[PDB]
Design an enzyme around this catalytic site. Structure first.
Site, PDB file in Angstrom:
ATOM      1  N   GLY A 149      -0.795  17.699   5.552  1.00 12.90           N
ATOM      2  CA  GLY A 149      -1.926  18.188   5.214  1.00 12.90           C
ATOM      3  C   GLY A 149      -2.673  19.171   5.887  1.00 12.90           C
ATOM      4  O   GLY A 149      -2.260  19.410   6.989  1.00 12.90           O
ATOM      5  N   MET A 165       0.635   0.456   3.601  1.00  8.01           N
ATOM      6  CA  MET A 165       1.739   1.358   3.330  1.00  8.01           C
ATOM      7  C   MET A 165       1.692   1.469   1.582  1.00  8.01           C
ATOM      8  O   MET A 165       1.604   0.371   0.878  1.00  8.01           O
ATOM      9  CB  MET A 165       3.097   0.781   3.726  1.00  8.01           C
ATOM     10  N   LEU A 166       1.785   2.705   1.626  1.00  3.83           N
ATOM     11  CA  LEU A 166       1.655   2.902  -0.178  1.00  3.83           C
ATOM     12  C   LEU A 166       3.040   3.776  -0.589  1.00  3.83           C
ATOM     13  O   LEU A 166       3.945   4.234   0.500  1.00  3.83           O
ATOM     14  CB  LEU A 166       0.415   3.761  -0.541  1.00  3.83           C
ATOM     15  N   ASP A 207     -11.957  15.722  -3.507  1.00  2.00           N
ATOM     16  CA  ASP A 207     -10.529  16.439  -3.505  1.00  2.00           C
ATOM     17  C   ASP A 207      -9.564  15.809  -4.414  1.00  2.00           C
ATOM     18  O   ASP A 207      -8.221  15.370  -4.109  1.00  2.00           O
ATOM     19  CB  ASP A 207      -9.922  16.838  -1.984  1.00  2.00           C
TER      20      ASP A 207
HETATM   21 BR1  LIG Z   1      -1.949   5.154   2.503  1.00  3.17          BR
HETATM   22  C1  LIG Z   1      -2.416   7.073   2.835  1.00  3.17           C
HETATM   23  C2  LIG Z   1      -1.636   8.180   2.676  1.00  3.17           C
HETATM   24  N1  LIG Z   1      -1.865   9.173   2.620  1.00  3.17           N
HETATM   25  C3  LIG Z   1      -3.143   9.640   3.161  1.00  3.17           C
HETATM   26  N2  LIG Z   1      -3.755  10.805   3.008  1.00  3.17           N
HETATM   27  N3  LIG Z   1      -5.182  10.324   3.343  1.00  3.17           N
HETATM   28  N4  LIG Z   1      -5.303   9.069   3.537  1.00  3.17           N
HETATM   29  C4  LIG Z   1      -4.069   8.586   3.056  1.00  3.17           C
HETATM   30  C5  LIG Z   1      -3.731   7.190   3.212  1.00  3.17           C
HETATM   31 CL   LIG Z   2      -4.675  18.856   2.491  1.00  2.52          CL
END
Ligand SMILES: Brc1cnc2[nH]nnc2c1
Ligand SMILES: [Cl-]
Ligand SMILES: Brc1cnc2[nH]nnc2c1
Ligand SMILES: [Cl-]
Ligand SMILES: [Cl-]
Length: 348
Positions: free
Chosen positions: A34, A106-107, A153
């Site tokens: 990101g 963890m997602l 966002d």
């Molecule tokens: Br889990 C998780 C995964 N990606 C992310 N981006 N920003 N916060 C987050 C938390």
């Molecule tokens: Cl981003």
């Protein structure tokens, strides 16, 4: 020569699979990227569980913004002790090698990954409804007076599945979020999901998230973004193709109305005049959501023809909710408490 060799030229930590941090975390691999920095999958030896670690850029502006993010996450998590309002949980944070690191549960993958998995056919209307209802419940939570949090966002990539085959979600990346009355940027939201009042340079509130949500829901069903602008001018014109010229009471207070629009002596507004001989957009309000969605023609592109859970009545209810989420007027745009009461969510 960056951060004594630990960083690349773009303020990111140079991730090495198998690196162990602080005798606690074993770094498995990069899993996300990101503008903020990076996300990695790691195993926490102490708690004996997998986690995701967001590594913020070693760069002051990014560190300072992520401090806001930490405060909003800890604030939300303490008002969501049961973990039922669909907001990711910040387990803890630390400084390592001059990077703020935020440790999350963890997602699974995000809603974009899910769409790509269907080859952008779009997910079913029943599954879209599940996402919309969760999402609306989440925005209702954000709107509680103690929080008053604007995510700023929302996009498919920031809504994650808990588990890749099930339909439970969590919102992530409060990295540009603010609280009502603590607004500090004018260029916010991802362009496709960016609201008219933000395009217009106007003051904004939590209602910009509901705009983003209406764009997201359409894209989850059709497979493609509803307003796919290449820059802000093209973004505003794409919105005008579907919704018409914005009402004068809005444009009369819009500091950036002249970027897109022109006021005629009688006080009505139109699109800025284009170079002679250049037709590029559909005339205002002639690209109907009714046809984008295929309400009476079998769903988007007709791909849902003959399926259950995709009736004409189903689609009309969907369209009505979407249009209420896409009200130009932030003050009458449907609010999370009332969205949950919409007939699109009844029954079953
Ligand atoms: Br889990 C998780 C995964 N990606 C992310 N981006 N920003 N916060 C987050 C938390
Ligand atoms: Cl981003
Ligand atoms: Br504004 C507007 C845009 N698209 C539509 N489709 N059906 N009704 C609509 C109203
Ligand atoms: Cl289904
Ligand atoms: Cl288009």
């Amino acid at each position: 020569v960056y951060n004594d060799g630990y960083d690349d030229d773009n303020y990111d930590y140079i991730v090495k699979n198998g690196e162990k941090w602080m005798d606690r975390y074993e770094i498995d691999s990069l899993i996300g990227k990101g503008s903020f920095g990076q996300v990695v999958k790691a195993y926490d030896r102490v708690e004996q569980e997998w986690v995701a670690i967001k590594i913020i850029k070693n760069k002051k502006a990014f560190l300072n913004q992520a401090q806001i993010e930490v405060r909003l996450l800890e604030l939300m998590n303490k008002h969501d002790t049961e973990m039922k309002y669909y907001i990711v949980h910040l387990k803890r944070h630390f400084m390592f090698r001059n990077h703020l690191c935020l440790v999350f549960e963890m997602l699974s993958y995000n809603l974009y990954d899910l769409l790509r998995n269907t080859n952008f056919r779009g997910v079913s209307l029943n599954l879209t409804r599940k996402f919309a209802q969760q999402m609306c419940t989440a925005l209702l939570f954000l709107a509680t007076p103690e929080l008053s949090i604007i995510h700023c966002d929302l996009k498919p990539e920031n809504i994650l599945l808990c588990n890749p085959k099930r339909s439970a979600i969590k919102i992530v990346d409060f990295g540009s979020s603010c609280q009502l009355g603590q607004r500090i940027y004018q260029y916010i939201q991802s362009r496709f999901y960016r609201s008219p009042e933000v395009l217009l340079g106007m003051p904004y509130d939590l209602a910009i998230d509901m705009w983003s949500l209406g764009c997201i829901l359409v894209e989850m069903h059709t497979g493609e973004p509803l307003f796919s602008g290449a820059n802000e001018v093209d973004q505003m014109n794409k919105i005008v193709e579907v919704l018409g010229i914005p009402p004068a009471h809005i444009l009369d207070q819009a500091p950036k109305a002249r970027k897109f629009f022109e006021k005629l002596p009688d006080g009505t507004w139109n699109l800025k005049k284009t170079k002679d001989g250049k037709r590029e957009y559909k005339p205002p309000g002639t690209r109907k959501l009714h046809n984008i969605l295929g309400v009476e023609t079998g769903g988007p592109g007709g791909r849902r023809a003959g399926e259950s859970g995709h009736t004409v009545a189903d689609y009309l209810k969907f369209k009505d909710l979407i249009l209420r989420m896409l009200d130009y007027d932030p003050k009458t745009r449907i609010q999370p408490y009332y969205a949950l009461q919409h007939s699109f969510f009844k029954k079953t």
